[PDB]
Amino acid sequence: SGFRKMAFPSGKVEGCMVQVTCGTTTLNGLWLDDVVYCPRHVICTSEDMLNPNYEDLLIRKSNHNFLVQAGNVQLRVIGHSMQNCVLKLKVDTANPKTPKYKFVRIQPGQTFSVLACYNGSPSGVYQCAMRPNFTIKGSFLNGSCGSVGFNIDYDCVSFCYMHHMELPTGVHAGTDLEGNFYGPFVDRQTAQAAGTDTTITVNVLAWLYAAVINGDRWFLNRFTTTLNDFNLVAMKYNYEPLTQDHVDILGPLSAQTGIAVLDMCASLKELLQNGMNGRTILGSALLEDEFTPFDVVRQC
Amino acid sequence: SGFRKMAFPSGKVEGCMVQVTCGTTTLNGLWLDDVVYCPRHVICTSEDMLNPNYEDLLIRKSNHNFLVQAGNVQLRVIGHSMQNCVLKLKVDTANPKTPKYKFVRIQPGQTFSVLACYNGSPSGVYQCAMRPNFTIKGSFLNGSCGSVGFNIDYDCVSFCYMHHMELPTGVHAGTDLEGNFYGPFVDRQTAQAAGTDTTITVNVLAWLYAAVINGDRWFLNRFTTTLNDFNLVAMKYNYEPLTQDHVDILGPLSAQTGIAVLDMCASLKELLQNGMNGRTILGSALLEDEFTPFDVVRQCSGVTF
Numbered sequence: 315s316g317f318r319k320m321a322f323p324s325g326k327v328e329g330c331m332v333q334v335t336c337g338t339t340t341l342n343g344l345w346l347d348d349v350v351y352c353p354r355h356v357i358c359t360s361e362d363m364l365n366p367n368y369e370d371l372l373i374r375k376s377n378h379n380f381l382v383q384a385g386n387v388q389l390r391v392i393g394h395s396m397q398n399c400v401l402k403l404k405v406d407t408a409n410p411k412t413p414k415y416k417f418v419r420i421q422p423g424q425t426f427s428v429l430a431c432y433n434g435s436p437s438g439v440y441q442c443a444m445r446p447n448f449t450i451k452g453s454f455l456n457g458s459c460g461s462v463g464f465n466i467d468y469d470c471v472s473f474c475y476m477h478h479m480e481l482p483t484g485v486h487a488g489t490d491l492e493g494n495f496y497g498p499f500v501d502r503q504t505a506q507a508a509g510t511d512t513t514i515t516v517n518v519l520a521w522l523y524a525a526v527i528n529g530d531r532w533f534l535n536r537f538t539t540t541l542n543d544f545n546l547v548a549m550k551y552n553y554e555p556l557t558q559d560h561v562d563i564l565g566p567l568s569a570q571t572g573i574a575v576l577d578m579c580a581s582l583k584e585l586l587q588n589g590m591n592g593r594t595i596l597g598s599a600l601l602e603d604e605f606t607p608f609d610v611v612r613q614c
Numbered sequence: 615s616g617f618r619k620m621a622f623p624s625g626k627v628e629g630c631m632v633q634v635t636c637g638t639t640t641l642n643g644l645w646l647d648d649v650v651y652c653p654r655h656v657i658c659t660s661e662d663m664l665n666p667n668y669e670d671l672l673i674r675k676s677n678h679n680f681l682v683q684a685g686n687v688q689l690r691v692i693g694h695s696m697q698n699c700v701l702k703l704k705v706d707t708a709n710p711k712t713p714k715y716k717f718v719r720i721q722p723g724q725t726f727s728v729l730a731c732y733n734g735s736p737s738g739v740y741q742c743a744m745r746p747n748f749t750i751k752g753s754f755l756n757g758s759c760g761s762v763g764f765n766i767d768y769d770c771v772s773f774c775y776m777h778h779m780e781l782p783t784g785v786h787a788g789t790d791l792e793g794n795f796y797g798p799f800v801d802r803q804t805a806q807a808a809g810t811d812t813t814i815t816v817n818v819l820a821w822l823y824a825a826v827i828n829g830d831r832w833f834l835n836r837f838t839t840t841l842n843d844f845n846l847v848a849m850k851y852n853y854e855p856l857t858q859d860h861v862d863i864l865g866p867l868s869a870q871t872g873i874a875v876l877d878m879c880a881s882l883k884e885l886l887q888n889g890m891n892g893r894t895i896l897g898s899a900l901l902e903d904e905f906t907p908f909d910v911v912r913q914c915s916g917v918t919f
């Protein structure tokens with residue numbers, strides 16, 4: 315019993331963190347086999363940042379301009395190429411600690427663990443969700459670029475995010491490991507803003523099921539609702555619409571607790587209308603939306 | 615920017631987790647050098663748990679009754695002894711992944727990371743605090759006993775907790791790595807209950823400083839208070855008393871933000887007597903007490919491990 319925001323054990327990713335230096339910029343790289351992946355903005359000279367021509371900047375670089383450090387050992391860069399917004403530095407040594415891995419692109423609402431790093435060194439691990447506006451609400455200081463988001467599939471690490479940027483509101487933007495940004499962001503210092511964020515409705519429902527599994531039932535009610543009526547109410551509270559796919563995904567939790575999805579939807583509608591009235595759900599006074607249905611099943 | 619509940623990187627601890635089986639019970643062990651540490655209740659059946667004589671049960675066991683598995687390799691138990699509520703199984707092989715470590719006993723209010731394991735396999739890592747009632751509000755299913763709590767100091771893992779039990783309210787109890795329970799708990803199936811929990815006041819203040827560092831300032835006020843007047847108010851809201859040591863430990867955050875500790879205490883007093891008024895601090899509608907002053911400094915300064 316109990317319910318915590320839980321990250322994946324970070325060991326398999328820590329064995330991959332390296333420091334990448336180019337000129338005066340130092341950030342983190344992900345060393346997998348004989349390739350170091352890192353944000354391409356490491357080759358930018360501050361001025362370049364506004365309207366960089368990355369293909370042009372990269373052609374002017376040599377392998378000896380890139381300084382890669384794995385612990386107290388300098389790795390030799392023997393090649394460099396760019397894949398979208400990620401720079402790939404081929405090195406002369408394959409990482410002996412390379413785990414079984416894959417590169418996955420995730421959808422909004424999906425959760426993942428972040429191993430925050432500075433100078434190629436792991437400082438902490440936390441759990442995040444990809445927001446509906448494609449940002450993440452991370453905890454990142456200057457020097458954290460190249461820190462990665464991942465999930466673990468038994469023995470396999472699925473890398474889903476690499477940190478590139480912090481927006482003016484303090485939220486963060488990044489790419490998958492193929493260098494494609496999540497959201498309409500660009501790796502340029504041009505004026506950028508995240509869209510208004512919304513609540514991940516399917517995740518809140520998953521967390522209400524987690525609360526029932528843990529004995530918290532005060533918010534339950536005798537009502538049910540249509541999916542259309544639920545969406546009309548939820549959207550006026552900045553909640554994402556719930557699709558039939560989300561109803562289906564919540565099926566196992568519904569069968570486990572004996573509370574139909576639309577029945578739990580009517581509880582969520584009531585919580586949005588009344589608030590908590592001094593009560594908490596799983597020790598929280600706000601509805602939590604960073605636990606997916608898969609996270610709840612795994613943890614409970 | 616940003617403020618998250620952050621655990622220490624778990625890699626140094628993952629290399630130490632093993633599966634310990636004795637009879638029909640399987641739980642986790644911590645393999646350090648040539649010793650595997652685990653809860654001594656692994657020797658118990660459902661009957662023994664009611665009233666166990668652990669010294670008597672252990673004398674009747676042989677080394678071959680304990681099955682230790684590190685990954686897909688079976689370790690040979692060549693000795694067994696008990697230290698308080700922890701069982702120590704001497705093995706024939708020293709763990710090559712043994713990090714620099716130490717066994718430390720933490721105080722209530724101190725935080726640590728928990729590497730939750732099942733069958734000697736790490737499944738998740740989370741951050742928690744040792745509550746003032748000596749329980750932890752963890753997340754543990756059956757099979758998680760032997761999971762450990764730790765902190766990292768430079769490159770040294772300080773093991774501070776081993777999981778043993780879940781109380782009827784869903785909160786958890788365990789021991790340090792020398793087998794001494796945190797709190798008035800015992801390792802027997804007998805009616806047990808945690809004392810009334812209180813809020814870790816110094817940690818709430820540390821988190822209010824974290825909010826100010828992140829630009830959340832609405833709760834700040836012009837007032838200050840005496841430590842005595844603050845403690846009189848705080849204790850009527852089930853808050854732990856704030857000591858001069860807590861005031862001193864908050865000093866670097868007070869210097870960084872320009873908000874004296876007793877000035878922040880007057881903000882906390884108002885938040886208690888009046889509530890948040892529909893507002894949040896760091897995205898939370900409740901005052902968070904599981905960040906120590908050291909955690910806030912470490913996170914708002916990027917200390918690495």
Ligand SMILES: CO[C@@]1(C(=O)Nc2cncc3ccccc23)CCOc2ccc(Cl)cc21
Nearest residue numbers: 355454455456478479480500501502503615
């Ligand atoms: C070069 O890095 C930038 C950045 O966002 N960095 C950061 C990323 N994370 C946390 C940060 C905390 C504090 C300070 C900067 C942070 C700053 C300039 O504008 C840009 C423009 C584009 C890109 Cl892809 C990055 C960047």
Ligand SMILES: CO[C@@]1(C(=O)Nc2cncc3ccccc23)CCOc2ccc(Cl)cc21
Nearest residue numbers: 315655754755756778779780800801802803
């Ligand atoms: C050893 O098992 C006990 C236990 O608490 N185990 C658990 C520990 N964690 C999470 C659990 C989740 C769900 C079910 C049990 C959990 C239950 C029987 O009585 C006792 C009595 C004493 C002790 Cl020290 C442990 C125990």
Ligand SMILES: [Cl-]
Nearest residue numbers: 723816906907
């Ligand atoms: Cl403290």
